[PDB]
Each structure stands twice: as structure tokens, then as C-alpha cells.
Design a protein around this ligand. Sequence first.
Ligand code: AMP
Ligand code: AMP
Lengths: 245, 254
Amino acid sequence: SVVISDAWRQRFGGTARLYGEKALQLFADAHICVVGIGGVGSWAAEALARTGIGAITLIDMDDVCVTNTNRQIHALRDNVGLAKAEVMAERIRQINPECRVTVVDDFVTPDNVAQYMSVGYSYVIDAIDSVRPKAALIAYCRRNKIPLVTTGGAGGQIDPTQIQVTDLAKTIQDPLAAKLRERLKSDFGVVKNSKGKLGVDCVFSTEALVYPQSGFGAATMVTATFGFVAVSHALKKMMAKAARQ
Amino acid sequence: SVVISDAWRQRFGGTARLYGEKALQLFADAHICVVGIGGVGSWAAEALARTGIGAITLIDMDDVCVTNTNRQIHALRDNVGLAKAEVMAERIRQINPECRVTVVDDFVTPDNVAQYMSVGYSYVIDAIDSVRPKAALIAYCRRNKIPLVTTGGAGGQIDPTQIQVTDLAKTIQDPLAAKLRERLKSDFGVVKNSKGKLGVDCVFSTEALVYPQSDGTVCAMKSGFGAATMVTATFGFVAVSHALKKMMAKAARQ
Ligand SMILES: Nc1ncnc2c1ncn2[C@@H]1O[C@H](COP(=O)(O)O)[C@@H](O)[C@H]1O
Ligand SMILES: Nc1ncnc2c1ncn2[C@@H]1O[C@H](COP(=O)(O)O)[C@@H](O)[C@H]1O
């Protein structure tokens, strides 16, 4: 158990008053991994930090680019050209200097997923944009019962109020999620239950895609909300599991 | 009005691809005011900046406090003690160096509201928590046809997916929004029209508020409330997306 300090309580007293004290300690003791520190994952990382999560691992190899400005929290003039995960880590340490932050400067693949998951996370937030590594991460967590929430495509969507969580089998208006389902079936043997579920929780939006007016565009208001919904869902699941003993 | 530089196109190419070039220009030419740079308003400011809005005014007099950390984007160890609005303005300059940012180092009151709205904003996002100034800001915007979105209480709520926008007359499970309607009726004579509406768009949540108990548990019931970034920021984001939707619709009409 992480020892909650007096400074921690000043930072996160609003967390305790919202989730309860038991949950404050649960979060302080958690270790959550965010894979992909982009339009969705950067805001998920931010949210975790600001809700008193005591250890966070960030996995990404990309650099901050000027084109990230429309949708990524780390995308500032002075950060362009630096490694996203490390820039996000430094920010998290400014949020909570007592958070233990680990950076994995790499992409997830079939060959390294086991090693990177071997840490033993309380949750994994999958915010990867590419379908191949995405499928590899999901298939691994799902087989190994590692708690996971995945995110669909957040581009080409303008309305944050249509974001919701459902089984990956049941998402609509999400070409990324659809390709992911195909890849999981074809490459990993993952297929629906008797109930028609893949047993993978997925943040998506019912909104129909808005085609490009350099692929689909994106907006902070939606991409960040994907990440915030993923975090709220993960924390809810962790609190329910803990109450179920 | 604003000539979009190549740097600006690089920053906001994703914005253009989502909303169109005409919208990119509309946003570059816009001037939006954020009142209250806190749990809701700091994220609304961030979103405006990140959506290529060309001018932003920020109104607040408070300083960054360590207790802001759970829900405000400017709450970082090195910023504690500095004025919230100025820290945010400085961040907005890092997002878009060509954004025109104005800091009003003050609180809105019944007596100064006309001066602070007199500028001619494309939109006002009201993220003030205190009720009497909030009522005064809304009454003034509403009377003067100044495009406004207001935000109910984002504290005591955990679910970002229940946030939506409706007329202030129709909000539920929002005690702030209900005390507001009263102050507006009582001090400004703002009351429902015959269709049941106040003519004020409000971000609110259908979620029942969660109240902290003396024993450290919390109890949902249909320094006060706790809060979470995931919910407070999404209030701000839903406000911004609503405003931009309305602005684009207005521009489509001509
Ligand atoms: N296989 C992977 N493992 C970890 N992070 C990834 C992987 N593939 C893509 N990413 C990151 O996912 C992020 C996507 O963000 P965005 O560009 O907004 O969709 C980027 O920062 C990528 O570098
Ligand atoms: N009358 C006012 N005019 C402008 N900003 C205000 C006023 N009253 C409160 N605020 C700010 O509104 C913000 C509310 O943030 P929060 O504490 O997260 O609700 C704080 O930064 C306050 O300083």
C-alpha cells in the first residue's frame, strides 16, 4: 500500500469526497498502463494523474509533432520534436510529484507484449491507433484476464455526448473497431461468445463519421472525451471488483 | 479578418479536415470569452485554443491552489500561487502563438458585466460557480442577444456519458441550475416563455449528485462536493462543441 501523504490529500481531497476514502487508497495503490499517448491516450494519462492514481506507465515511441496540436495535451510549441511519453511523464510528475511514472519508449507487438504486461497492471488503457499492435495488445490482455478498456476511432466525430462503452462486438460507426474485430478473428482466434460478445469493453461513439473535408480530422472535445470515458469506466470497474472482494 | 498562416494550417490541419475550411476561417476570425477558469472553464479554454479559435478572453481573479489538482488543467506544482487566468493565457500562447489572448484580472459582477461583454464576442462560455454573478452574466447576455452557453454544477458527478445540453428550464438533477432559475426570476425577471423555455442553453448532467458523508463514504441522492477531471473537463468540452455547432449553423444560414 502506497502511504498517502498530507500533500496527496491536499491535491486529491476532491477525489476522496467524490469516490470515497476507500477509493482514494485504491487509486493510490493502482498501477495503470496507457498504451498510445496520442489524441485519446494523452488525456487518459492526464485524467489518471489528476484522480490520484499512484503509478502510471506510458507506452509510446512517437514524438510530439506540430500536427498534434488540435487534439493532444502535450502538443505545445516547446515540446515539438520531443518524445510524447517522456513529455507526458514530466507533466504527470508536475501534477503529482509522488506518482511513480514509468516510460516505455516502444510500440507494442506480438513479441514484446508479454514482457511489457508482465508488470501486473491494475488496468490497461488501450489508446493505440494502428490495428495490428492494437489487436496484439487486446488479444493478450483478454487471454490473460488483464483488465482492459479499449478505444475505437475518435477521428471524424464532432459530438462528445454520443461517446459510450459497449462490448467491442457491438460498436457501430467505427471503422477502426470493425477492422480490429476482423484482425482479432483472423490473427488471434478471437471470436464471439454464445452471447455474441467478444468480452472486450470498447469506448466508441454512435455518431456517424464525418469524412475528410491526413485522413479523418479530429477535435480535442471528442478525442479527450474518449480518454476520459475510458478512465471513468476503468475506475468504476476497479471499485466494483474491490467491493465484490 | 485573420489571415491563416502556414504554421496555423500545420497546427490545425486536423480541424480543417473535420469541420471544413470555411469553419477553420470562421474559428480563426472568432473571439470567444471564458468566464471562470476552473474545473470547467480551464478545459473549455484549452479546447478553444486547440480548435483554432483566433481570439480568446479569459476572466478570473483567482490563483492556482494545490486543491485545484484533481480537476483543473493549469494546476501543476510550479504554477501554485500564480493567477489562473494568466497561467492559462500563457499555455494558450504555447498551443497557438498566433492566438490573441486577453486576460481580465477580475470577477464578473452585476456592476461590471456590461463593460466586460461590451467587446462583441462570437460566444460566451459561462463557467462561474457562484450564483449571483452567474445570474447577472446570463441575464445580460440573454437580454443583449450575446451567444452564450452556461454550465450547471459539475461537482458530485462521476459519469461523463450523462452530460448533455438543454434549455436551462428543462435541466434535472442539477441544484446549481435550479438555484440559478430562481435568482433569474427573482432579480432579473427572466421566466419561461409560453413554450416552457428560458432561452438559455445549459450543459448539465442527468446524474444524481453524490454527497460526501462524515464517515468518508459518499452517497448519491437525487468543502462541499468532490469532482473529477473526467466529468468537469467534459462539461467544458460539451460547451465548446455546442457553441461551435451553433456558430457554424449561423454561418451556414449566412
Ligand atoms: N503499437 C503501439 N504501441 C504503443 N503506442 C502506439 C502503437 N501504435 C501507435 N501508437 C501511438 O498511438 C498514438 C495515436 O494517437 P493519434 O495520432 O491521436 O491517433 C500515437 O502517439 C502513436 O505513436
Ligand atoms: N464572479 C466571477 N467572475 C469570474 N470568475 C469567477 C467568478 N466567481 C468564481 N469564478 C471562478 O470560477 C471558477 C470556478 O472553478 P471551480 O472551483 O472548479 O468551480 C474559479 O476559478 C473561480 O475563481
